Each structure stands twice: as C-alpha cells, then as structure tokens.
Amino acid sequence: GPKFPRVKNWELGSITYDTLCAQSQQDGPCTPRRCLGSLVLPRPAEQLLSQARDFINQYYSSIKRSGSQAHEERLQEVEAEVASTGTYHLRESELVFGAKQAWRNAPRCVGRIQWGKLQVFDARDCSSAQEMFTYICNHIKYATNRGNLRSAITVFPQRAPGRGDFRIWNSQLVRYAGYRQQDGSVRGDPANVEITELCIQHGWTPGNGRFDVLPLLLQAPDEAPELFVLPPELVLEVPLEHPTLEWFAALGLRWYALPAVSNMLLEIGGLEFSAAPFSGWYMSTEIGTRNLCDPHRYNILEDVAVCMDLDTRTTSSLWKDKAAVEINLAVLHSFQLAKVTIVDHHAATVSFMKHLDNEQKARGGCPADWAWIVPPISGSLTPVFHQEMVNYILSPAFRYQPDPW
Amino acid sequence: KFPRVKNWELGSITYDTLCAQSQQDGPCTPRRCLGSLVLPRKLPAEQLLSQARDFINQYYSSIKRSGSQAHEERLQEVEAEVASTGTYHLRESELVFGAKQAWRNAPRCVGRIQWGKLQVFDARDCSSAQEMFTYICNHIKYATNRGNLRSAITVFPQRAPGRGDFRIWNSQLVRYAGYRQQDGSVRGDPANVEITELCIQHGWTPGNGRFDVLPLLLQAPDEAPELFVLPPELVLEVPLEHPTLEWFAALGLRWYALPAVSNMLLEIGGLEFSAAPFSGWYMSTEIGTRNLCDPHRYNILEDVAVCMDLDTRTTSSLWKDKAAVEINLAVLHSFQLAKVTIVDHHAATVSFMKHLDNEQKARGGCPADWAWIVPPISGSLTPVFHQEMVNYILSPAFRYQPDPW
Numbered sequence: 096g097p098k099f100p101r102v103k104n105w106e107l108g109s110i111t112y113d114t115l116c117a118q119s120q121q122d123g124p125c126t127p128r129r130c131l132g133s134l135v136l137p138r139p140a141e142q143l144l145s146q147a148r149d150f151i152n153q154y155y156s157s158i159k160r161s162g163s164q165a166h167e168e169r170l171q172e173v174e175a176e177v178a179s180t181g182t183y184h185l186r187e188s189e190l191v192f193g194a195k196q197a198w199r200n201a202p203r204c205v206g207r208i209q210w211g212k213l214q215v216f217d218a219r220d221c222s223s224a225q226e227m228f229t230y231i232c233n234h235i236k237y238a239t240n241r242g243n244l245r246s247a248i249t250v251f252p253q254r255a256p257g258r259g260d261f262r263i264w265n266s267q268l269v270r271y272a273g274y275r276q277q278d279g280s281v282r283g284d285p286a287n288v289e290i291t292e293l294c295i296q297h298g299w300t301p302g303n304g305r306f307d308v309l310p311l312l313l314q315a316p317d318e319a320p321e322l323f324v325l326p327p328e329l330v331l332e333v334p335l336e337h338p339t340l341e342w343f344a345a346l347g348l349r350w351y352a353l354p355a356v357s358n359m360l361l362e363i364g365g366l367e368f369s370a371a372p373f374s375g376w377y378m379s380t381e382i383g384t385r386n387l388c389d390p391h392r393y394n395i396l397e398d399v400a401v402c403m404d405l406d407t408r409t410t411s412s413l414w415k416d417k418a419a420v421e422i423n424l425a426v427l428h429s430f431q432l433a434k435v436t437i438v439d440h441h442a443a444t445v446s447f448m449k450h451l452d453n454e455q456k457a458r459g460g461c462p463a464d465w466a467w468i469v470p471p472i473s474g475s476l477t478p479v480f481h482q483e484m485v486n487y488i489l490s491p492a493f494r495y496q497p498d499p500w
Numbered sequence: 501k502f503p504r505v506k507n508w509e510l511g512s513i514t515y516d517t518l519c520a521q522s523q524q525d526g527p528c529t530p531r532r533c534l535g536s537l538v539l540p541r542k543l544p545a546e547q548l549l550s551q552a553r554d555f556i557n558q559y560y561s562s563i564k565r566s567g568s569q570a571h572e573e574r575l576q577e578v579e580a581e582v583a584s585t586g587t588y589h590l591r592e593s594e595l596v597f598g599a600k601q602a603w604r605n606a607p608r609c610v611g612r613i614q615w616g617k618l619q620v621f622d623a624r625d626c627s628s629a630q631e632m633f634t635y636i637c638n639h640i641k642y643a644t645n646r647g648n649l650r651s652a653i654t655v656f657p658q659r660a661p662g663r664g665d666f667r668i669w670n671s672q673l674v675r676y677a678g679y680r681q682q683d684g685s686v687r688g689d690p691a692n693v694e695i696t697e698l699c700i701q702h703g704w705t706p707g708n709g710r711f712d713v714l715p716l717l718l719q720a721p722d723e724a725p726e727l728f729v730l731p732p733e734l735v736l737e738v739p740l741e742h743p744t745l746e747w748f749a750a751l752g753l754r755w756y757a758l759p760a761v762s763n764m765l766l767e768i769g770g771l772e773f774s775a776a777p778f779s780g781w782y783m784s785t786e787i788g789t790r791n792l793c794d795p796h797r798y799n800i801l802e803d804v805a806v807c808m809d810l811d812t813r814t815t816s817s818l819w820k821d822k823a824a825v826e827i828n829l830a831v832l833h834s835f836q837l838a839k840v841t842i843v844d845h846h847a848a849t850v851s852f853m854k855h856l857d858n859e860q861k862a863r864g865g866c867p868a869d870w871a872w873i874v875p876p877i878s879g880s881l882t883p884v885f886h887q888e889m890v891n892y893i894l895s896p897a898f899r900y901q902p903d904p905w
C-alpha cells in the first residue's frame with residue numbers, strides 16, 4: 096500500500112491514509128521504543144527565517160498565488176525585515192489566516208468543524224494593561240452575544256527581542272475562585288487555588304463562595320501585573336436544574352457560559368503571541384463530567400448520588416455512572432432553557448467525524464489526539480471512539496507555555 | 501531520558517525505567533503518534549539465541565538462582581540446541597514462567613493484578629486436531645468451575661521452520677454466530693459473520709438464533725481445519741435481566757461466562773506458540789457496552805431506550821447514555837444472581853492502579869495502553885483516566901497474528 100499511516104474506522108470498515116503528517120516539522124514525544132501519547136504536557140535568525148518562509152508559503156498557497164511575483168516579493172520583504180530587526184511583522188490577513196490555521200491544526204479540539212468561521216480581533220496596537228482590559232471586555236461581549244455564542248480570538252502584541260511579554264496570568268478569562276480552608280479542604284474550584292492566592296497577594300479582596308468569579312491579572316511588558324474586576328453583567332452564568340429531579344436546583348450549582356482559554360501561546364511563522372485568548376462554546380461534558388465531577392474539581396458525584404438515593408457503598412450499583420449522567424442532562428437542559436449555546440458529546444463528535452471527512456479531502460488528513468477527542472462519559476457510544484487517529488504537530492499552533500510567575 | 505509519569509488526580513509522580521528493557525519497536529515515531537491504532541501495519545541464529553539467553557536469564561533471576569550451576573548449564577543446553585538445530589525447547593517450569601510474564605507484560609489488559617495466579621496446561625504433546633479439542637474441553641471445564649471462574653492458558657506446540665502451524669481458527673473459544681441475511685442485515689453477532697460462514701463451508705449445520713454457540717475449527721499442521729461442536733453443558737451462559745425493569749428479561753438477551761482468546765500468538769524466548777488460548781473473567785463493560793451496544797455488534801441501544809420510554813429524537817436527552825447504564829447494570833445483576841465471576845469497571849480500574857503501584861516497586865514501571873485500560877463508559881469517573889501511562893513492548897508477549905485462511 097501507500098507509505099503513509101493507514102487509519103481505520105472499526106464501526107464502518109473504512110480506511111484512509113494520512114499524507115498530511117508529512118508536513119509536520121516538529122517532533123512530538125513518542126519514539127519506536129515507547130508511546131508517550133497519553134501524557135498531558137510534552138516537556139535565532141536562521142531558525143526564524145525558515146519558519147517565516149514556510150508560513151508565507153502556506154499563506155500564498157491558501158490564496159492560490161504560490162510561485163507568483165507577490166509571493167516572492169513578500170518573502171524578500173520578510174528576509175530583509177529580519178535582516179535588520181531580528182524579527183518581522185505579519186500583514187493583517189496573514190494573522191487572520193494564521194489564527195484560523197492554528198485552531199484547525201489543534202489536535203485536542205473537537206470543535207474544529209467551525210474553524211473557518213472565527214472572528215479575529217487584531218489587538219497588536221495594545222500598549223497598556225488598562226487597554227488589554229478593554230480589548231478583553233470587548234471580546235467577552237462579542238463572543239457571549241447574550242447567549243448566542245460566537246467563536247473569537249483577540250491577538251495582543253508578539254514577543255519582542257529584549258522587551259518583556261504581554262501575559263494574561265489567568266488560565267481562563269472566566270474561572271471561579273478557590274479558597275484553601277483551615278481544615279485543609281477547599282471552597283470553590285481546587286483547580287484555581289494558586290491563581291486565587293496570587294490575586295489576593297496583588298490586592299483583590301476575596302469573597303467566600305463556591306462560585307466567585309475571579310478578577311484578571313493582566314501584565315504589560317516589563318510591568319507588574321495589574322488587577323481588573325470583570326463587571327458582573329458581562330459574565331453570563333447559567334443556574335443548574337434538572338428536567339425531572341426537582342430537588343436538583345436546590346443544590347445551587349451554576350456554570351459560566353463562555354469558555355475562554357487565555358494562557359496559550361499562539362505561534363505563527365516563528366512569531367510568538369504570548370497573549371491571545373480564544374473562546375468558543377462549551378461541550379456539555381467539559382462542565383457536567385470534568386468540572387463538576389472530577390475528584391480534584393468540584394467533586395459533587397457522591398452528593399448527587401445520595402440525593403438520588405443510590406447505593407454509594409458498592410461499586411457495582413453503578414451509582415457513579417447514574418449520577419454523572421443526570422448531572423450532564425442537567426447541564427444540557429439548563430443551558431437550553433436559558434438560550435445559551437452548548438453542544439452535547441453526541442452532536443459534537445458527529446460533527447467532528449464530518450470535519451475529519453472534510454480534511455481528508457482538503458489536506459489528506461487531520462491531526463487528532465484520540466484520548467482528548469473521545470468524551471469522558473459514554474466513550475464507545477460516540478463514533479470517534481471507533482476511529483483511529485494520527486497525532487502530530489503542525490504550525491501555526493497553539494502551545495502551552497510556562498506560567499509567568 | 502526516562503519518562504516522567506504524572507497522576508493528575510493525586511499530583512504524584514513516577515519515572516518509568518522499565519521501558520529501557522524494550523527490544524521491540526511499536527508504531528510511533530517522533531513525527532506522529534499511532535498509539536490509537538488497533539493493529540500493526542506489519543500484517544536467524546544469533547537473534548533467536550540472544551532472545552533465548554535473555555529469557556533464560558529472566559527465569560533464573562525470577563527464582564533467585566542467577567549464576568548457579570543449573571543456570572550456566574541450562575544456557576549451554578540452549579546454545580548447543582540452537583547451534584545444531586536452529587531452534588530449542590522450553591522446560592515446563594520455564595513455560596509456566598513465560599506465560600505468566602506474557603500476561604504481566606500485556607499493556608491492554610486491565611486484569612493484570614491477577615498475573616501470578618495462572619493455571620498453565622502444557623499441551624505441547626499434541627499431534628492432532630482431535631487431541632487439541634480434548635485439551636480445549638478440559639481448559640473450558642477447569643476455567644469455568646461451575647461459575648467460579650479461574651484464570652488459565654493451554655499451550656499447544658510451537659511453530660517450526662519445516663511446517664504449518666497449529667491454529668484455532670476461532671478468535672475466542674465461545675462466540676455467537678453471525679448469519680448474513682439476503683437483505684444485507686445480520687442475525688446474531690455481526691463480528692462473526694466470516695467465521696460463521698467458514699464453519700458452514702467446512703460442514704457445520706447452522707441454526708438460526710441470535711445466540712447460537714459456534715463450533716471450533718481446529719487445525720493441525722498442513723491439514724485442512726476440522727470442526728468440533730462444544731458440548732452444550734461445557735458452555736455456561738447467563739440469561740440477562742435487570743433488578744427493577746421487569747420487561748428487560750423478555751428481550752431474550754444472554755451471554756457466555758468464559759472470555760477465552762484463541763487467536764493470539766504467545767512468544768517466549770524467541771519461540772512462538774501459534775495456538776495458546778487463554779481465559780480469565782469478564783469485566784462487565786466488555787459485555788454491556790461493547791458487545792451489546794456497539795453499532796457494529798448487537799446494537800441494542802435503541803431497543804432498550806424505547807422500552808425505557810426515552811426521547812429518541814434528540815441526542816441531548818442522553819437516551820443512549822441512560823440505556824447503556826441500565827444494560828451494564830443488567831449484566832452485573834444477572835452474573836451476580838447466577839453466581840458467575842464478574843468484575844465491574846470501577847473495581848477493575850481500582851485494582852489496576854494497585855497493580856501499577858506494585859509494578860513501580862517491583863520493576864520500575866508498567867507498560868499500559870491508556871485507550872484500552874480506560875473503560876468505554878464513565879472514563880473520567882475511573883481513576884485510570886487521570887493516570888498517565890507509558891506503552892511499550894516487553895517480551896514474553898502476546899501478539900496478534902494473521903487469520904490462517
């Protein structure tokens with residue numbers, strides 16, 4: 096057969112080959128000796144120019160002007176700029192393409208069917224932390240759009256030689272506080288203890304609830320971060336209830352509408368955008384299973400199961416399985432009622448199978464991380480479970496980056 | 501570098517150093533990860549000799565006599581036998597140790613806490629299909645044990661340069677027939693259509709139920725395969741009911757007690773055993789979720805859901821998730837009622853974490869395949885979801901091999 100990974104779908108019996116992987120220039124963590132595919136983190140002039148060149152070619156290819164005068168002129172322009180400044184700058188429509196291409200390239204995102212329909216806010220003029228705040232507020236208002244959510248990303252200035260970075264300290268634009276107690280436990284979200292304690296250290300007067308929205312710690316170059324409270328009206332939340340278990344509302348659970356990742360680095364043609372928050376809309380298991388039920392997050396599974404009156408003293412009653420299902424139903428139902436966009440794991444994964452089909456035709460494959468694409472309840476009930484996937488790093492890219500503290 | 505392996509629920513950290521002992525490539529490279537592929541693409545005197553020496557070293561070291569008379573003397577026997585014949589033979593105790601270590605090394609098996617408790621039947625003195633069937637019926641009898649199941653492996657004669665293999669054509673010892681209908685559909689288990697047809701073409705008179713136990717096709721070397729019907733009393737089945745849903749039993753569903761894999765190759769010290777069926781006991785999700793609910797298997801989700809009276813018209817009612825839970829519950833209830841050994845996915849994964857811990861102390865690691873260890877429902881509800889895992893191949897090993905036709 097072809098000298099390319101063969102990829103099989105075990106439900107349908109169908110076969111493809113991934114030719115796209117040939118274009119990866121960046122090693123992941125696996126070797127022939129051992130697979131490290133389940134780990135979460137995978138821890139200069141000539142280097143830059145070759146990455147810049149690569150990207151500019153991708154751009155010209157995407158507008159069908161590869162080999163052209165305009166193309167060879169853009170390349171010259173970029174070697175000359177690097178020649179005398181050590182860096183270069185992207186045209187506007189280049190950044191729009193890079194950003195969409197980084198999303199499209201993200202192996203862990205199941206929402207990629209929407210990749211072409213992404214609003215890109217250029218914020219590369221931003222010169223202060225106050226100005227970040229405004230740009231961020233504007234993003235939240237656009238993206239939230241009173242519950243009818245819209246994909247977006249706001250791109251702050253790139254890293255620059257010698258000068259410090261623009262950074263958002265928060266991992267999301269909207270996260271709930273985590274308060275370490277005298278008895279060792281935690282009130283709120285245990286995932287957020289450190290950022291909470293940093294916000295206090297920097298002068299935030301802390302609340303004491305389970306669902307206190309955190310302030311933003313925003314940092315402009317070579318400056319201490321500054322603290323900004325989001326105005327409550329901008330932060331859409333949804334109270335949780337259940338369609339038939341009338342008591343479920345009594346639990347006082349709630350989640351926010353807008354999932355916005357704010358500590359990832361966006362890399363395009365070697366340029367590094369250290370602050371570039373993006374947002375989409377939730378898939379229901381992000382909230383109902385991971386956020387609410389992880390042992391190390393809100394961990395509410397026993398609580399709900401006791402209210403449902405299940406036998407929590409024995410694994411084989413499947414009490415965890417039942418309660419998680421009903422928590423997920425409540426998330427779905429409560430967002431529908433409140434007219435806030437959300438997608439269930441069945442719909443989401445169907446749409447991702449379609450994306451895979453599209454990309455197979457458009458590019459000869461799709462980098463995908465199986466363990467993240469498959470949801471954390473009802474795995475094999477979704478079609479992605481039965482699809483082999485090939486995982487690799489393409490550029491443009493979103494990458495993790497070390498916390499700034 | 502030895503990889504760092506984090507558990508994300510507890511914050512703990514290990515380093516796998518056991519992977520340094522892998523002598524066998526898997527499918528990944530640093531350019532792309534193929535960890536989600538089910539099969540390898542794939543489907544010498546100095547070499548056999550060094551694999552042999554290594555295995556013998558493992559054995560003598562296992563029983564603590566590394567260096568003794570008997571150790572050096574046994575290495576020479578092996579050297580003398582390969583030099584003269586191109587092969588060698590294992591002593592029975594060596595075989596017992598190799599089979600146990602093959603199970604222990606299997607990265608996809610969640611049952612490995614049990615690895616030391618394995619009954620090994622030595623069937624290397626077997627010269628016909630007839631004899632294989634007798635050995636098979638004794639394996640089934642022992643392993644079944646009137647429902648008090650017990651781990652077992654029966655080992656038929658090794659592969660030999662001169663000649664065809666001993667093979668069990670069936671992929672498991674007990675399996676339900678899949679009969680293709682003129683109008684494309686399938687009565688019984690669609691996974692077994694092909695082997696159902698081969699049984700018919702080598703003589704078997706077929707039935708017409710959804711749960712017809714298949715005969716075995718057993719092949720002695722260079723001979724047409726031969727057909728043997730299992731005595732119905734050797735094959736213990738469990739009818740399926742639900743603890744509270746009265747109608748569930750009248751669906752007619754059932755399943756067999758003994759999960760016995762009959763098509764994998766067992767490799768020890770470079771020697772290869774093409775027929776070496778093994779069995780343990782079921783993890784309930786193997787039956788409730790995959791066997792009964794996969795779209796390409798019995799595919800009963802819709803049926804159950806309508807009986808439960810759920811809204812099938814939309815995914816966001818989570819009817820599939822609800823039905824799947826009740827089916828897995830029926831399976832555990834029904835096996836508990838019939839006094840047949842079963843383990844649920846919660847108890848199983850808990851015991852696998854314990855096993856990881858024993859193996860970190862004993863060997864400095866444990867090869868595991870995260871996509872296989874994490875169950876098909878309620879993934880993140882189980883501790884293995886949160887646990888990073890390193891996958892690699894150690895010998896002795898179970899391997900896949902071609903269907904012999």
Ligand code: HEM
Pocket residue numbers: 194197198201203204205206207209213246247248373374375376377378381438443467493
């Ligand atoms: C449009 C709706 C979207 C949906 C439903 C969606 C869904 C998801 C989901 C379920 C994950 C898994 C992350 C987790 O559970 O922790 C994910 C990861 C990701 N998504 Fe999206 N996404 C969407 C939009 C976007 C957009 C607009 C971007 C970028 C512009 C994006 C980039 C990513 C990236 C980079 C990851 C990986 C994050 C990580 O590794 O921690 N997604 N997405």
Ligand code: HEM
Pocket residue numbers: 603606608609610611612614618651652653778779780781782783786843872898
């Ligand atoms: C004693 C109870 C046992 C349990 C609960 C158990 C459980 C499992 C499970 C859940 C899997 C994944 C299989 C699937 O559904 O696809 C598996 C795979 C496997 N188990 Fe076990 N197992 C047991 C005993 C054994 C024994 C005795 C052996 C060998 C002698 C063994 C060897 C394997 C191997 C080689 C695989 C990989 C099969 C493949 O790749 O298709 N297991 N086991």
Ligand SMILES: Fc1cccc(CCNCCc2ccnc(-n3ccnc3)n2)c1
Pocket residue numbers: 135204206267354355356373374375376
């Ligand atoms: F504790 C950790 C250390 C490193 C990475 C990690 C995973 C973070 N994953 C972010 C998931 C996330 C959150 C909000 N919003 C999105 N999102 C938005 C659009 N597409 C995805 N994704 C955890």
Ligand SMILES: Fc1cccc(CCNCCc2ccnc(-n3ccnc3)n2)c1
Pocket residue numbers: 538539609611672759760761778779780781
């Ligand atoms: F269609 C396929 C092509 C290649 C591999 C495949 C997976 C089969 N995997 C074994 C499943 C299985 C069945 C019964 N019993 C066990 N078993 C017994 C002890 N441990 C596991 N395992 C399917």
Ligand SMILES: C[C@H](O)[C@H](O)[C@H]1CNc2nc(N)[nH]c(=O)c2N1
Pocket residue numbers: 133134135466467468508885886887888889
């Ligand atoms: C250890 C394992 O890699 C880790 O727990 C992964 C598994 N799959 C995931 N999948 C998604 N979508 N998000 C995650 O955070 C994780 N966590």
Ligand SMILES: C[C@H](O)[C@H](O)[C@H]1CNc2nc(N)[nH]c(=O)c2N1
Pocket residue numbers: 105480481482483536537538871872873
């Ligand atoms: C494509 C994917 O690798 C395949 O469906 C795997 C996923 N994980 C699995 N895990 C187990 N335990 N058994 C399986 O058959 C599978 N199938």
Ligand SMILES: [Zn+2]
Pocket residue numbers: 125129130131132528532533534535
């Ligand atoms: Zn890999």
